[PDB]
Design a protein around this nucleic acid. Structure first.
Ligand SMILES: Nc1nc(=O)n([C@@H]2CS[C@H](COP(=O)(O)OP(=O)(O)OP(=O)(O)O)O2)cc1F
Ligand SMILES: [Mg+2]
Lengths: 392, 544
DNA sequence: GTCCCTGTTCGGGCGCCC
DNA sequence: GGGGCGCCCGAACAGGGACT
């Protein structure tokens, strides 16, 4: 085999991202995996004269005593030059075809940008640095360069099983069928066998979370005040929402716990608004040259709400994620893995997340709960407590 | 002597060229030491005499340790390529395990034993007032540390492979070597390590070969069952300057790793207005008092222990007021592995539950660096205070495994906003407006019982008037109050339950909230003619 | 757009190690 | 003169809300 040249986008350096502290577990696993990869020629030791760096860690998959190395290539990916039926299937299995990539060499003059560093416990030693000689798992370029080789492999299986949808996303193969679960699994095993000789999701059970208005036999000034603020916000998403009649009940300067009987108008306006919320959002077109943005709100009691959009108030999807000794960060981490999965399946792209958590909290613990082979972009926000009421 | 290791290839930054800089005048005490050093180096191949075919030059000088030769490559360092530093942190004694046998070796003339890339030697040209260049790593170049540290690691890698159960802590040219052998057999391994280094050109002078406890290492003294910091001494000036307090801040911080209780808030608050290092500063009573407290805890004798991987790590946190926190980490009670402080103020407004959650995060990260695992925590906060906070709070927040410790001052939430509006509590509709032009404002309220107040403010901001109005409603209400606001800004601050703030005004608001039996704060959208948010809007906007 | 207020980064100084 | 980590501080952004 001979390599494919690869460039960065013009006016861009390679990544220079500092390695973060790893646990003893993860370091032991990384050192194991790396020495073997260095035997098999997939990575080489390098020096400090290579100025590039990219974080590494490792995840303990399932219960299995098998670790998976995971390189955070988000930066490098940002800097690397540049299947509708799948969401319908009864079952989707996700396969990890990452190691296939190690069979293709990698443009020599590019290898230096794939540098990473293994830390030691208590800084017994300086870091050990490696760079890749082959297509690295997690890199944007790896499925690209390997596509033609991936197609050649799959093409016969696709022929023999035309009802089956196979989608690839970096290290991942999504395999969808309408088979009952036993024959599905048997087919997956069949596709695995086919893959060997070269070298559980349920999409149409994905519900959306509608905005919904409370029902009450008596309304206080407070109740109505909450209602009108909520409607007034929602009207930014559903311009047919109307608040005029209801608001007119709050003329005067009244006690919060004073009871207000609703007029005929106000009941009608409330009835309309109830219906308008049913009617699906209009005029939202997925734009693949724009970021997918995800917001998550903590609702409490293991309840999480999310929306995916690209323009403010123009939601592509809105959802809920539900689950004593609950672990918020775990839950959040699991929520963003779930949302990312949906987002890949529906649009083949990974959303930028707005996380309702302090940076240090998140960065302290999220690798403890991560099970995906990809990592989405994210940023940290201070949720104005208004919006957590809006998706109540 | 000179390592036969491969040189590390190194470049200038694109489109740049070597330094051309005049050697500044130098005392003869130094010139004598220079040529003494240079005649030997030149004899040994480490520096070569150059001619006039070398355009470049860089100033050199010396300081006493014997003498250390230095080169002010600040200009070369600017033109050189970037390096990824391989030194990720500083080994700490509390992460060492008990070893049967221990050695500490220093490597002799370390840098000068590692060859410098040939194609790069020319740029290192320097002139004694005689012209030379470097054939080995120079002290002052920014590439020398990483190239040394990396070369050292290549050199130790075979020995480490062959001897996986000998532990070598490698800090620049410093080696701590620990084994579970008897001293006889340990010493045989040491010798094997020294001949290994000598094969690669690195000598280990017996002069710096420590064979008996207490070992001197990284600023500590290592005894077989305990460790201590090397003596710390604080200045005793009467007049203090910026640069003096910094020396005191820094030294206290360093002490805080093993001396429990250290605090540096007030001392630090001093260094705020300053624009230059020379300024002297009045040691405020708050600060002068702190000094003595610290100064007192230093007099007592103190030591950490080593790490037993087969027991648990325990971190125990204590609160010290003014956003100051101290901790101790141990496996067995009153036998500290180490200690620390946390004192960072994050946010304009915060409470003690957040700060405690930040101390936990810090300690967790630090523990992962040193021991590679998370400790179990012991915290001055009720399991039920925590759950209240975790419930109501809108952010994901979490604390790893922990038990309560009733060692006051206990961490507590100082007030709680009601979830439902209060019956028999007067309803205040507050609001503020400000003029961006004149900076003039108004804050006021209107209440369901007919009360109405408007206060005019000067030199204010919109957000401020909005907080002023809330404060005003708190001031003129009974022990139970409903307040309706249209400010996300104000609602956002108060709903997160701060007990401390950078803002005097928010502090005053906080004090009111604690006085009250019941507060219910509610939000409405502005300019939507909600009554009587609508009625108080007219009032505070008039003339504004 | 502008001001305001809040957050983050990143470069000062000092400590400590080599 | 160099590299590392730590601590504190203030400068320069980057956001989102409220306003003419
Ligand atoms: N202030 C320092 N600047 C440095 O560049 N170094 C570097 C990093 S470690 C290396 C030590 O060099 P040397 O071995 O000649 O130092 P040394 O005289 O302390 O040790 P030795 O007497 O040669 O065994 O110098 C050390 C310093 F303390
Ligand atoms: Mg030495």
């Amino acid at each position: 085999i001979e390599t494919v040249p690869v460039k960065l986008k013009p006016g861009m350096d390679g990544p220079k991202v500092k390695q973060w502290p790893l646990t003893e577990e993860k370091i032991k696993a990384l050192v194991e995996i790396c020495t073997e990869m260095e035997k098999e020629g997939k990575i080489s030791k390098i020096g400090p004269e290579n100025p590039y760096n990219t974080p590494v860690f490792a995840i303990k998959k399932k219960d299995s005593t098998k670790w998976r190395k995971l390189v955070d290539f988000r930066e490098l990916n940002k800097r690397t030059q540049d299947p509708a039926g799948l969401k319908k299937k009864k079952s989707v299995t996700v396969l990890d075809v990452g190691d296939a990539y190690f069979s293709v060499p990698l443009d020599e003059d590019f290898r230096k940008y794939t540098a990473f560093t293994i830390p030691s416990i208590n800084n017994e030693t300086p870091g050990i640095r490696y760079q890749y000689n082959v297509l690295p798992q997690g890199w944007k370029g790896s499925p690209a360069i390997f596509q033609s080789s991936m197609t050649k492999i799959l093409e016969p299986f696709r022929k023999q099983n035309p009802d089956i949808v196979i989608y690839q996303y970096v290290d991942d193969l999504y395999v969808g069928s309408d088979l009952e679960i036993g024959q599905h699994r048997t087919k997956i095993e069949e596709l695995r066998q086919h893959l060997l000789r070269w070298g559980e999701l349920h999409p149409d059970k994905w519900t959306v979370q509608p905005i919904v208005l409370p029902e009450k036999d008596s309304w206080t000034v407070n109740d109505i005040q909450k209602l009108v603020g909520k409607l007034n916000w929602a009207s930014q998403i559903y311009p047919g929402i109307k608040v005029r009649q209801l608001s007119k009940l709050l003329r005067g300067t009244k006690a919060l716990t004073e009871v207000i009987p609703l007029t005929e108008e106000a009941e009608l306006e409330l009835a309309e608004n109830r219906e308008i919320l049913k009617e699906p959002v209009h005029g939202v077109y997925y734009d693949p040259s724009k970021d997918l943005i995800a917001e998550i709100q903590k609702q409490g009691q293991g309840q999480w709400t999310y929306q995916i959009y690209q323009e403010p108030f123009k939601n592509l999807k809105t959802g809920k994620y539900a689950r004593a000794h609950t672990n918020d960060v775990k839950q959040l981490t699991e929520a963003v893995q779930k949302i990312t999965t949906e987002s890949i399946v529906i649009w083949g792209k990974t959303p930028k997340f707005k996380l309702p958590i302090q940076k240090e909290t998140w960065e302290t613990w999220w690798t403890e709960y991560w099970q995906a082979t990809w990592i989405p972009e994210w940023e940290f926000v201070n949720t104005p407590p208004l919006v957590k009421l809006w998706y109540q | 002597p000179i390592s036969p290791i491969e040189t590390v290839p190194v470049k200038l930054k694109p489109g740049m060229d070597g330094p051309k800089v005049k050697q500044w005048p130098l005392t003869e005490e130094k010139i004598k030491a220079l040529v003494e050093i240079c005649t030997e180096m030149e004899k040994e191949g480490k520096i070569s005499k150059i001619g006039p075919e070398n355009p470049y030059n860089t100033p050199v000088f010396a300081i006493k340790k014997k003498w250390r030769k230095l080169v002010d490559f600040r200009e070369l360092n600017k033109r050189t390529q970037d390096f990824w530093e391989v030194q990720l942190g500083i080994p700490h004694p509390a992460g060492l395990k008990k070893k049967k046998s221990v050695t500490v070796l220093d490597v002799g003339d370390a840098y000068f034993s590692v060859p410098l890339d040939e194609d790069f030697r020319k740029y290192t040209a320097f002139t004694i007032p005689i012209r030379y260049q470097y054939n080995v790593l120079p002290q002052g170049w920014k590439g020398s540390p990483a190239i040394f540290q990396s070369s050292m690691t290549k050199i130790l890698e075979p020995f480490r492979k062959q001897n996986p159960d000998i532990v070598i802590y490698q800090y620049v040219d410093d080696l701590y070597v620990g084994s579970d052998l008897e001293i006889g057999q340990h010493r045989t391994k040491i010798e094997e390590l020294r001949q290994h280094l000598l094969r690669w050109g690195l000598t280990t002078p017996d002069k710096k070969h420590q064979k008996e406890p207490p070992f001197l290492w990284m600023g500590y003294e290592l005894h077989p069952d305990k460790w201590t910091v090397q003596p710390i001494v604080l200045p005793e000036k009467d007049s203090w300057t910026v640069n003096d307090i910094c020396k005191l801040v820094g030294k206290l911080n360093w002490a805080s790793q093993i001396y429990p209780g250290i605090k540096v808030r007030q001392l630090s608050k001093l260094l705020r207005g300053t624009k230059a290092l020379t300024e002297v500063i009045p040691l405020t009573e708050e600060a002068e008092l702190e000094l003595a407290e610290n100064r007192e805890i230093l007099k007592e004798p103190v030591h950490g222990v080593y790490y037993d991987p087969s027991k648990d790590l325990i971190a125990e946190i204590q609160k010290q007021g003014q956003g100051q926190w101290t901790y101790q980490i141990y496996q067995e009670p009153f036998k500290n592995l180490k200690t620390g402080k946390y004192a960072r103020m994050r946010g304009a407004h915060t409470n003690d539950v957040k700060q405690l959650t930040e101390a936990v995060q810090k300690i967790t990260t630090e523990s992962i660096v040193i021991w590679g695992k998370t400790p179990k925590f012991k915290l001055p906060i009720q399991k039920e205070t925590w759950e209240t906070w975790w419930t109501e709070y809108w952010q994901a927040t979490w604390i790893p495994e922990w038990e309560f410790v009733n060692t006051p001052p206990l961490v507590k939430l100082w007030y709680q906003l009601e979830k439902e509006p209060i019956v028999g509590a007067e309803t205040f509709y507050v609001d503020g407006a400000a003029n961006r032009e004149t900076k003039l404002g108004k804050a006021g309220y209107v209440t369901n019982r007919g009360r109405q107040k408007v206060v005019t403010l000067t030199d204010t901001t919109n957000q401020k008037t909005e907080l002023q109005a809330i404060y005003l409603a708190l001031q003129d209400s009974g022990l139970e109050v409903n307040i309706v606001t249209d400010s996300q800004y104000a609602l956002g601050i108060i709903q997160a339950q701060p007990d401390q703030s950078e803002s005097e005004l928010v502090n005053q608001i906080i004090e009111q909230l604690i006085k009250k039996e019941k507060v219910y704060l509610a939000w409405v959208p502005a300019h939507k003619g909600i009554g009587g948010n609508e009625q108080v809007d007219k009032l505070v906007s008039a003339g504004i």
